[PDB]
Amino acid sequence: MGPGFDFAQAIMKKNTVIARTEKGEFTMLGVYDRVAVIPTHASVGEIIYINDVETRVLDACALRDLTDTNLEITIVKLDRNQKFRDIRHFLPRCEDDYNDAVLSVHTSKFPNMYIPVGQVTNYGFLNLGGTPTHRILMYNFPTRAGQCGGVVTTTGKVIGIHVGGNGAQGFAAMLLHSYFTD
Ligand SMILES: COC(=O)CNC(=O)c1cc(C)on1
Numbered sequence: 001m002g003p004g005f006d007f008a009q010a011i012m013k014k015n016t017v018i019a020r021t022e023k024g025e026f027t028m029l030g031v032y033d034r035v036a037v038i039p040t041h042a043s044v045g046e047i048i049y050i051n052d053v054e055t056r057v058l059d060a061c062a063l064r065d066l067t068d069t070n071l072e073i074t075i076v077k078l079d080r081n082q083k084f085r086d087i088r089h090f091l092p093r094c095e096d097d098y099n100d101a102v103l104s105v106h107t108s109k110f111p112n113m114y115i116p117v118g119q120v121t122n123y124g125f126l127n128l129g130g131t132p133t134h135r136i137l138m139y140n141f142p143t144r145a146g147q148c149g150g151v152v153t154t155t156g157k158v159i160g161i162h163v164g165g166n167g168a169q170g171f172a173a174m175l176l177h178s179y180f181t182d
């Protein structure tokens with residue numbers, strides 16, 4: 001409807017795939033080459049389905065900060081025959097707050113879904129499903145089962161992936177440029 005949704009759509013149409021693990025179907029953001037991200041609770045294994053194609057996982061790493069605290073981001077390298085458009089220049093360098101964010105989801109259950117979530121708070125520490133987690137972003141939307149791995153954008157920036165909610169607020173893990181230096 002407006003430039004927030006325009007940026008979000010441009011990211012979904014070229015930089016997302018549907019990832020299936022034993023723990024369900026997730027929106028998965030492709031970042032550069034064959035490298036993508038998914039929430040660590042997806043429990044990526046040796047094989048994953050990508051748009052319903054059996055795909056070998058070449059490498060997967062559950063990120064933690066230098067306090068050895070969960071970040072809830074897994075970086076996956078896929079044995080795929082095609083590279084993602086490089087979107088690393090849209091990743092923030094620092095932890096920050098944001099206005100006017102969009103959460104975008106693409107699965108069999110929720111195709112072409114875009115949610116204007118509004119203001120995003122650098123919340124930081126949260127107990128997420130019993131797991132102490134850092135760098136959590138918070139927004140006041142009653143997000144639901146099926147939105148995990150959804151992409152959080154502003155106009156011009158890709159700032160996080162949706163990892164949970166409590167029924168009133170939703171929670172995302174930050175994406176930082178430093179995660180994807182090669
Ligand atoms: C909204 O209430 C909160 O708990 C937010 N916490 C902070 O202020 C905070 C945490 C980190 C890291 O940087 N600022």
Ligand SMILES: COC(=O)CNC(=O)c1cc(C)on1
Pocket residue numbers: 041127128129130163164165166
């Ligand atoms: C503050 O309330 C919560 O932490 C709600 N829990 C989740 O969002 C959650 C995510 C996963 C996986 O398992 N539980």
